[PDB]
């Protein structure tokens, strides 16, 4: 606290100046109080100087140590974060590939179902692949126009 020490020193100096002026104008308790204030100010100044040196040394040491530790920790954290991002991208690609492989292996078509579809579809153009059958060609899913729209679904089943 530089403010308190400066105030004490200024008060001691003012008391000393007043005592000197009184002694010069003349030819006790005031001088004793001024001397006690000056001694207390000197002791407080010495103690504050020692404490300030100690605090400066400790602040420099702690600043250097904390800067080194924080720089090391931040560098390690950034490196670990980049490595974890790379590993997470790799694991995400691997999980996507594994899900695709599972959907490819666990899912399959039935031979008997396809054989029955071919045996029952060889009558009309329902699920048969024509020669010029591109996406959006005249091939449709319905068996016929009159057999589906005007057939049993439209007449008997409405």
């Amino acid at each position: 606290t530089r403010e308190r020490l400066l105030s004490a020193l200024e008060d001691l100096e003012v008391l000393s100046r007043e005592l000197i002026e009184m002694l010069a104008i003349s030819r006790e308790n005031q001088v004793l109080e001024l001397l006690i204030h000056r001694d207390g100010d000197f002791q407080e100044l010495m103690k504050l100087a020692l404490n300030q040196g100690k605090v400066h040394h400790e602040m420099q040491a702690l600043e250097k140590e904390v800067e080194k530790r924080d720089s090391d920790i931040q560098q390690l954290q950034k490196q670990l974060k980049e490595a974890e991002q790379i590993l997470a991208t790799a694991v995400y690609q691997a999980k996507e590939k594994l899900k695709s492989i599972e959907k490819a292996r666990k899912g399959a078509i039935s031979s008997e179902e396809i054989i029955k579809y071919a045996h029952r579809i060889s009558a009309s153009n329902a699920v048969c692949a024509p020669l010029t059958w591109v996406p959006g060609d005249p091939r449709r899913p319905y068996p016929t126009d009159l057999e589906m729209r005007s057939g049993l679904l439209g007449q008997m089943n409405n």
Partner: peptide, 19 residues
């Protein structure tokens, strides 16, 4: 997984950055 060894080098980089 071999790149993990590179991260292990970062651990060495953690040793050299401490001085």
């Amino acid at each position: 997984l071999e790149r993990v060894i590179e991260m292990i080098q970062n651990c060495l980089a953690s040793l050299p950055d401490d001085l």
